[PDB]
Amino acid sequence: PQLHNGLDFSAKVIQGSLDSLPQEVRKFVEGNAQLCQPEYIHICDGSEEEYGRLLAHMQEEGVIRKLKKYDNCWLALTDPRDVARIESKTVIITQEQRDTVPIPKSGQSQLGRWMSEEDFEKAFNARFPGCMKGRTMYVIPFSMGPLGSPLAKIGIELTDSPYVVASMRIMTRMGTSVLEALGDGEFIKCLHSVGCPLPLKKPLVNNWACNPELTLIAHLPDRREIISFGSGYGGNSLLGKKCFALRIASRLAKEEGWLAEHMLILGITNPEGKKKYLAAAFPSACGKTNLAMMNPTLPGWKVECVGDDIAWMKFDAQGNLRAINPENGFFGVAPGTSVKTNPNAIKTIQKNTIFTNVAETSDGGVYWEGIDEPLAPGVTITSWKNKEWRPQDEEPCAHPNSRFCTPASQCPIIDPAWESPEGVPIEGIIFGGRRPAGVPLVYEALSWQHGVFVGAAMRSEATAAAEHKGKVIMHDPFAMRPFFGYNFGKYLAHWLSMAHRPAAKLPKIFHVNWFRKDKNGKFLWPGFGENSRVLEWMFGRIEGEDSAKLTPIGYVPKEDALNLKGLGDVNVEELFGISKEFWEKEVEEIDKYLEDQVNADLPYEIERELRALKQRISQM
Numbered sequence: 001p002q003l004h005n006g007l008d009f010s011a012k013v014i015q016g017s018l019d020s021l022p023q024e025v026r027k028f029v030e031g032n033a034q035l036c037q038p039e040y041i042h043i044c045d046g047s048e049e050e051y052g053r054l055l056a057h058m059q060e061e062g063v064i065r066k067l068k069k070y071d072n073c074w075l076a077l078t079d080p081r082d083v084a085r086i087e088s089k090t091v092i093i094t095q096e097q098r099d100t101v102p103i104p105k106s107g108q109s110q111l112g113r114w115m116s117e118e119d120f121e122k123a124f125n126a127r128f129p130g131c132m133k134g135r136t137m138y139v140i141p142f143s144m145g146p147l148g149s150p151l152a153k154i155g156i157e158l159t160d161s162p163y164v165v166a167s168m169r170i171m172t173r174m175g176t177s178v179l180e181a182l183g184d185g186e187f188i189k190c191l192h193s194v195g196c197p198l199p200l201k202k203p204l205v206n207n208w209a210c211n212p213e214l215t216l217i218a219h220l221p222d223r224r225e226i227i228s229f230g231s232g233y234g235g236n237s238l239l240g241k242k243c244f245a246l247r248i249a250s251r252l253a254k255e256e257g258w259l260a261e262h263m264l265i266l267g268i269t270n271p272e273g274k275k276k277y278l279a280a281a282f283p284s285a286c287g288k289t290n291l292a293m294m295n296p297t298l299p300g301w302k303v304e305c306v307g308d309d310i311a312w313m314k315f316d317a318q319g320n321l322r323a324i325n326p327e328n329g330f331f332g333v334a335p336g337t338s339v340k341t342n343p344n345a346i347k348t349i350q351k352n353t354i355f356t357n358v359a360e361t362s363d364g365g366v367y368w369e370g371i372d373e374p375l376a377p378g379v380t381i382t383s384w385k386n387k388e389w390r391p392q393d394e395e396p397c398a399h400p401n402s403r404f405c406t407p408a409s410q411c412p413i414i415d416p417a418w419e420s421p422e423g424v425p426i427e428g429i430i431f432g433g434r435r436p437a438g439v440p441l442v443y444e445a446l447s448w449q450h451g452v453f454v455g456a457a458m459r460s461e462a463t464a465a466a467e468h469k470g471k472v473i474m475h476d477p478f479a480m481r482p483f484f485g486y487n488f489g490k491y492l493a494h495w496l497s498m499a500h501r502p503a504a505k506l507p508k509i510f511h512v513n514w515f516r517k518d519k520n521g522k523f524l525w526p527g528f529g530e531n532s533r534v535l536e537w538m539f540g541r542i543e544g545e546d547s548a549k550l551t552p553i554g555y556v557p558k559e560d561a562l563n564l565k566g567l568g569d570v571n572v573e574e575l576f577g578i579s580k581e582f583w584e585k586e587v588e589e590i591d592k593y594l595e596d597q598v599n600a601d602l603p604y605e606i607e608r609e610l611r612a613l614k615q616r617i618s619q620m
Contacts (some may be wrong), residue, residue: 009033009041014136015050016043021139022184025156029139032158032191037130038137044165046141046175051166058162062207064354068364071351075366076163077384078233078357082210084401084465085235085242087482090217091115092247094486102489102601110474110481111488111597120218127195127214127229134198135160140190141179142172144245144312144326149421151258151312151324153249154182157190157239161209164192164237167354167405170329172240188224188248190239195230206386208232219243221251221485234331234356234403242483245310245326251485254494258314262479264292265307265323265424267415268535271300276539279311279323279507280430281479283460287514287527289332293344293413296532298563303532304415305344306424307408308332313426319503322423327408334358334402338372341528344413345404353406357384359397368398400463427542429507433460433476434515438582441525441575442512442534443554444541448499450554451509453609456492457590461515475593489601496605508542511554516575524575526567533563551578552616580620587614 002008007030010018018026021043033041044050055074058064067073091113092100101112115123138159145152157168168174195211196204211230218227226243228236235242249260263279282288292308307325316322330348334355337345349355359367362380375381381397383389389397408414417424431454433439445451455478461471475481477488484491498504512534514527537557540547548555556576564570591610594602 007031007034012039013041013043016045016139018043021179022182024184025141025179025182025187028156028189029137029158033137035128036132036137036160036193038132038160039134040136041139042136043139044141044175046169046177051169054162054166058166063163065360067355067360067366069361070353070365073349073351073353073355073366075358075360076354076356077206077208077386079205079208079210079212080385081205081212082208082215082231082233083357083399084233085482086215086217086231087467088113089215090482091120092219092221092485093117093120094222098601099487101484102487102598105596105599109597112484115218120220123216123218124227127216128191128193131193131195131197131229132160136162138162138165140165140168140174141176141182142168142174142240143178143181144172144240144249145324146419146421147173147177147181149324149423151314151322151421151423152326153188153244153252154178154185155188155190155240155244157192159192159237161192161194161232161237163232167238167331168240170354170405170407171238171327171331173328186224188226188244190226190244192228192237192239193230194232217243219247219485221248224248234401238331240327241331245312246480246483247485249312249326249485250480250483250491253312254486254490258312260485261311261313262309262483263311263323263429264288264305264309265311265325265426266292266294267304267306267417267424268539269302269304270536270539276427276542277306277323277424278428278430278535278538279313279426280432281455281458282432283434283458283462283476283479285333285336285463286432286434286460289330289337289345290342290528291531293342293411294531295343295529296535297529297566298532298536301532301536302413303535304413305411306415306418313423315501315504316422319501319505320425321505321507323426324421324423325408325418329408330404330406330411332404332406334366334404335368335396335398335400336370337368337404338370340372341370344411348411349404349406352410353404355402355404357399357402359383359389368402369396425505426507428510428538430510430512430538431455431458431478432512432514433458435459435473435513436461436515436517438579438586439511439513439516440556440578441514441516442510442537443551443556444538444548445509445511445554448506448509449496449605450609452492452495453606453613454509454511454554455495456594456606475597487601489598489603492606493603496603508538510538518571518574524571530567537562552613552620553578553583578620580617583617583620587617
């Protein structure tokens, strides 16, 4: 069927067989092999042997280090210019801008970043032709969600990065069994390249191939394509992790009547043996991993982790909002993780874990800010920049965005249902932020519509990065600000429509704030495992207990409804205080923010909830 060789790349295949691929997977591979011109094609099978060989080969080539202190753990150090998501180079392509993002009244949108098809085609043509010369194109067949879950979705990621293959093995279900489940079905096309064809035009920094100048992370939801170039890091390269499971998935969910959210899922069991599942959307590094892996301090309470980052949710036939964790691993922020803050996370990462941009002890161990483990005299620290490091230095030993990548099955409190194909029934949805002033420990929404407004109005103190210096308070609606797959106003409309589904078992909605400070700057609430005392109250409110008092912002716990025994003197007046003056300012800021950033796409229900909140505050 060819006059020469076709687009038959069989001669370059060093693992697997092209003849064994479903026809459309094969066309995807060969079409992109022609474009990108890899030296080799490796069709991943997902086997332990493949994984071990891959790691051993990366070690030999100097791309990763084996950490000799642990069982099968590895360290990658990156080029300092490739250490995080780059928001300003992450884009969504649609025919109409407004389908992707509301048109902001001033400045740049904070809620999305559109690129025209025309501009994207020009960007694509300047990057991908020949970009894998000299390299292997890996074909990663992967399932987001348990294989054969009705909520699962399948992608194929092409990458030139073996780091990406190894990380994707942990973070997704991948290999031959996914191709067998796919058959001739639809899949999400995921194309990635580090953008460094051989021979190198510039020297490598830390043996880490990237192209910072040309980095571009693009999404084409209508084409079911994700196309990422020039970064090997995290959410730019592991295309399941944000591009697929939030950005593409949230647009599919809008089309198909489900939800793709930035939420942890936990199961909580009380002393009576009653269990509920909760979902929580917290702006990142607020303690998602912390809540989902909590060791509760209250006797007889248990928390089990279904997921710590992404939730796919859909109503079942009985009206329960069912959630699955579509991932297979945790890609957690390393700094701050310790035996005191998160002993379960520490147990998880003891083995079979890939670390990125943390410090290394002369031991062959790992280190970072906040690890809270002293080292023996003489044990030294190599920073993530491959330099000797002493605490005296201004710089951190580990990058602030450094990561562990670890199998979910190794979490010592992984929920028995964490892979159940039908998902777990969500009875509560928790929104949070870090707010040093004004916002009390916990409150409960007055209605579904109020609950959606609570999510839409979320703000949080975030550590200023390459966009800000110091802490900054930013709007992060539904903890989804960087992740919306489409116009945020339509996303709110989609949430609001859930109230209209007949016989829906709508979860209770709450907001929490672990980080309120008192008049001279100290934390009012100890947090960590003591947060179980707040989950207890939510649990009782889901059961309809008469434990709540009405306030202008929502229901709060009645006096003495919280178990505070053992906490010493809690300043309840300040912790649970509601200031008219603070809340007048909060509602005015939310009004300005929604008008500027959402304007004509804001649902009238949300504007009504703002109006109503304004009025309940006026009457204080």
